[PDB]
Nucleic acid binder design. Structure first.
Lengths: 683, 687
RNA sequence: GUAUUCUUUAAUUAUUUC
RNA sequence: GUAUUCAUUAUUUC
């Protein structure tokens, strides 16, 4: 409008937001003389809804904001969807005393509070709304009914409002019906929901899709029998389908739905999906058969769906069967099919499956692409068939395809399992000359080959090249990788770096840390950790609790470890673990305290737990220590007398202790290379 | 002697070259106790090396069965099943060789773990063709093989006889395997008879045994018989472990499960509650929880937090709050875990008031807030989008004497990311900088998203340049992901191709979000060539095209003025059997005609749309008018209007704007049309 | 301005608007 | 070496 005002507006929309108020002040008099409403509008067209906001708040604090000013921002805020801002204009009103608003605007604020769970404020506002003589509209009504619906237990107030609205001649719509039914749905008002809809009929009213889904939902968590039926034939399965997907989980039946559906594709596929995503594939395959059994001829896309849900259950045998019915019915498998048959969540016996998929994947033409081979490598990688992954890697290249980074990472996954790093290094080095530079994943997979290789070299060689941006994964992978190698420098090093970069560490790191102190020479940072893990608000684990006991055990303070064990007995959620029992027994044994140690073994059994090899092994050590070899020999009996099968270390610890005690023929009688240990000892 | 020195050589050598290295010190090897070298190489965990030598020696003819058996024990002990199936397949033994049973059974199990059953049976046949006597574990492994093939019950009954005829007595491993086999075929009756018959032999069953007998009933059948087993279980005195309740959980139904185990402890109750939780059936666990009380045992805070957590993931606010009150009313006073659990809730509607209602309890609970608690509260208020309250929580943090961390600044930017309020987002990151803090990646993602919802393209590019060069921010899948999106929302084609470039270059494997966006952006221009290449490349990737992929394709053809091809897909989606055309699908098709004309065709589509049920929207009609509004025709676009309000759908701003502009440019016959009923009637004035 | 399940470490003010 | 459901090639081995 005004050239002076256009300059002012441009000057406002260009100014940063944090400084703007100190700026608007400087132009106080300049602003007051103008039409803010016109500035707000101009600041809204230009796409700067947040600058008008600032202006409004400024003017309210000055007295130059009117209803129309506010009403303009609000309409902008709701179309833009900034409920928070709406709610704040209401909590810090830029309005002068009198001040009444347009209906549309009040209903936008009501929706904003609703959107925030401030149902109690919405109702306060609604009351204030009609005591100022504002005629609410259909949308205002529907918004308020929604407030009542999510606030809960407000059915009577809903009856009241429906009355009030009709008595003022505002007939309900579809947003009114669904809103209401979902309200009954959230309160278990099954009975009164139906009487409602069936009253909607009376007064006239065309039924709907969203309606039925709401009604559906009622009987859902609440009947889906004679009900869900109507919804169909009444008239289209859109969202209504999903409702079936959770209908099954909150209940339990396979006969009614078969008996129902019988009586009657997507619709079919929907219900099948409902079964296979909650883990009822046996239930879906039956739905599939029934479906086939009645005319219906599935296409490739229906098979890919069934195979897809069978796949998450690793039902290899029937996936191949389905693969059969396809190709022998015309339904030629597509790319999506093989990818589906190869994206199986790994189980035991996956290799031969994969092998059979590949056999039909190559006995049916289908020229394997580059990505196809990568998919086939990943598959044998999941199983762990290094042998078959690499045969695929070799067949690949020998056919002229060029391996990508996805192909190298695949192979790298494998070796990682087996901690074969000498082969990993070769992969990496190969990929570099080919031009391919390792990514983050490629590194984590290296860190894991090394750790299972006990190669600290390659570990610290990477810790250097990274300290390779250190991502939360890499730093977390490094903390672990060092713990397998039990490396305190490395672990600690990158521990604080995880904090200095604004990452929140999980119980894994904390647990891993606590123990690299317990079994080491630090026993206070440990206490720091168990105080940090808590101060952090995290819930300690048994493992955490067990690692804890090991600390006290190594600090020669065992009863305290016994306390934590006992305290676990009440935990009501924790519940010891022979490890916890073992760990405590190991400590007492380590301090010469062995009666106390078998006293906890007695509890152990009494509690109905189950002593094991390692458990007995501990005592034999602690007995051998203070040379009292008879009570020790009595133990190994117990193990075997109960068939617990001792360990050569159980024997060694006695042999080596029988040697040092000047008793040689004893070491001999009692009793491989061990006897040899006595010979090189005796003389 | 001289061996200890030679082992270290092989133990310290590049694996992919060890062959030629064993070829080197060959004659020192042939005179060395191979099996001896093997035993030594394993004593240091160098088992990959003991294999390579085996294969070497084998190729030289220097490996005997005693050696192979030695490598196999380790592999099995080191869990290396594929490697053993390899030895089976290549054979490093000379002709006429026979192996220990312990080894043979280690291979059988290895063949079983790869699904190579038909092969395991053939090896078993050989093993007993060499007059080797199988042991218990051998018989048991083979049983496990029979049980995973299917239709193998007679072979199980027959082998049971043999093994029992060789004086070999079944065990718990046997029982669980035979019962579990019957569970994998639906052999309910025989599993029972077998159990009955096995019991009657004096065999005391066990947990594992009872667990398989229960999977029978529960897998595909009944919850009443499986529950009965649960019955007979305790009656025997065998305590159901965690795996027990998992079977039931996966097998008014919660009222039953509690009636049986009634004729337990607090840990028991939690074990079954958590079972139903981890399955996804939580209303049941609640039901038990109602009983654990009205039955005696009183739950503590650990038990309650457990329950709250379950509710958390379902974000069942009101009940969570009820439960927090019953806690503090029945005596159970919350802890730092209780609160944190309460604020770790899943985003949703009305979450802001919940958090306020929780914080209201943290405060009254006279519990000093810590630096951590603030970070949580800021995060939750930031997660629901209560920008206003996050910042209030923020200033309250930095005023009680706590120091923000990066998470603290990240929470805050998360909110702004939803609002697009990048100006503040900047002002923050700098503050993060002026405090000795360096922005994370997510910090860069948030800021990125923050610029997107706004429209600030200069801050995006300012991120790309700092990402495509310096190391301040590494091109992480995430960061490149947040870029394809933030450039779409701002329609920066150039800046997406670069990202789709690097993604398909930095070793990444694009996702449907990325593909589709690329498809819609190319389609939003005439970019047919690339777009179709993207679509197929979706196919060549191995992903399933959703509706948005199909709608974007139709709009491309629209855009390319081939709207007939657009309907072929709508038809194709009509019989997709898996994908049902969407409202936006139909419109996209109609507009494509109306954009190039043939509105009588546009009517053709609308017709069936209604024929397929399908209830049209405003846009549906606003588009139909477009063609009828600007096609030397007005008597129709007026008749078409009477289908909106007369059908209570209500037109809109883009609509009428097409009526005046199109009519006031096709005059007077336009004036009377607009008179039939603000911001517009200045266009007419402008004309 | 409003409704029916999933979505809340979010493509869901995602793709259609002569 | 072998079995039951769906950081673990995790924490205890005088």
């Amino acid at each position: 409008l005004s050239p002076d005002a256009q300059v002012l507006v441009l000057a406002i929309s260009s100014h940063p937001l944090p400084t703007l108020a100190a700026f608007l002040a400087s132009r106080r008099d300049e602003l007051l003389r103008a039409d803010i409403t016109s500035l707000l509008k101009a600041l809204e067209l230009s796409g700067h809804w947040e600058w008008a906001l600032a202006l409004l708040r400024w003017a309210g604090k000055e007295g130059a904001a009117d209803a129309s000013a506010l009403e303009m921002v609000v309409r902008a805020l709701g179309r833009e969807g900034q409920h928070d801002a709406v709610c704040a204009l209401l909590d810090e009103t830029p309005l002068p005393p009198g001040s009444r608003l347009d209906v549309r605007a009040y209903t936008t604020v009501l929706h904003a509070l609703s959107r925030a769970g401030r149902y109690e404020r919405a109702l306060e506002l609604f009351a204030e709304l009609r005591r100022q003589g504002v005629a609410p509209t259909l949308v205002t009504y529907n918004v308020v009914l929604d407030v009542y619906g999510r606030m809960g237990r407000s059915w009577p107030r809903i009856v009241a409002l429906l009355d009030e609205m009709r008595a003022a001649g505002v007939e309900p719509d579809g947003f009114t019906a669904s809103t209401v039914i979902a309200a009954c749905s959230r309160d278990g008002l099954v009975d009164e929901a139906v009487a409602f809809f069936e009253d909607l009929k009376a007064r006239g009213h065309a039924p709907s899709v969203v309606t039925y889904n709401a009604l559906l939902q009622v009987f859902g968590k609440a009947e889906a029998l004679r009900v869900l039926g109507e919804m169909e034939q009444n008239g289209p399965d859109a969202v209504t389908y999903n409702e079936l997907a959770g209908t099954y989980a909150r209940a339990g039946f396979f006969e009614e739905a078969a008996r129902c559906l019988d009586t009657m594709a997507f619709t079919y596929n929907t219900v099948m999906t409902a079964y296979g995503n909650v883990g009822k594939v046996d239930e879906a395959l039956a739905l599939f058969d029934q479906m086939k059994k009645t005319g219906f001829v599935p296409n490739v896309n229906t098979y890919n769906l069934v195979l897809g849900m069978l796949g998450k259950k690793s039902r290899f045998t029937v996936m191949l069967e389905m693969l059969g019915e396809m190709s022998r019915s015309g339904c030629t498998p597509n790319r999506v099919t093989w990818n589906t048959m190869l994206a199986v969540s790994g189980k035991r016996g996956m290799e031969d499956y994969v092998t059979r998929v590949l056999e039909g994947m190559r006995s049916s033409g289908v020229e394997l692409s580059r990505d196809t081979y990568n998919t086939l490598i990943a598959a044998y990688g999941r199983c762990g068939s290094r042998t078959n992954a690499f045969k695929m890697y070799n067949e690949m290249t020998s056919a002229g395809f060029t391996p990508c980074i996805t192909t190298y990472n695949a192979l790298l996954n494998v070796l990682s399992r087996q901690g074969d790093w000498s082969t990993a290094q070769s992969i990496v080095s190969k990929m570099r000359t080919k031009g391919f530079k390792p990514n983050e994943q490629s590194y984590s997979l290296l860190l894991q080959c090394y750790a299972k290789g006990g190669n600290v070299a390659g570990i610290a060689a990477i810790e250097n090249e990274v300290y390779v941006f250190p991502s939360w994964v890499i730093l977390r992978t490094l903390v672990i990788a060092n713990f397998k190698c039990r490396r305190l420098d490395g672990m600690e090093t990158a521990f604080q770096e995880v904090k200095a970069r604004g990452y929140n560490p999980d119980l894994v790191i904390f647990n891993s840390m606590l123990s690299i102190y317990a079994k080491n020479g630090m026993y206070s940072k440990a206490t720091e950790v168990f105080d940090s893990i808590k101060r952090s608000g995290l819930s300690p684990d048994l493992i955490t609790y067990n690692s804890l006991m090991d600390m006290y055990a190594k600090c020669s303070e065992s009863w305290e470890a016994e306390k934590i064990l006992n305290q676990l007995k009440c935990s009501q959620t924790m519940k010891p673990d022979v490890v916890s029992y073992n760990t405590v027994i190991n400590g007492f044994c380590k301090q010469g305290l062995v009666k106390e140690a078998q006293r906890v073994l007695s509890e152990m059994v009494a509690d109905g737990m189950a002593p094991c090899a390692v458990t007995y092994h501990t005592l034999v050590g602690g007995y051998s220590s203070l040379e009292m070899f008879s009570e020790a020999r009595e133990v190994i009996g117990y193990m075997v007398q109960h068939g617990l099968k001792p360990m050569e270390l159980t024997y060694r610890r006695v042999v080596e202790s029988y040697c040092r005690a000047k008793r040689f023929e004893e070491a001999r009688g009692f009793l491989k290379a061990l006897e040899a240990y006595i010979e090189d000892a005796q003389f």
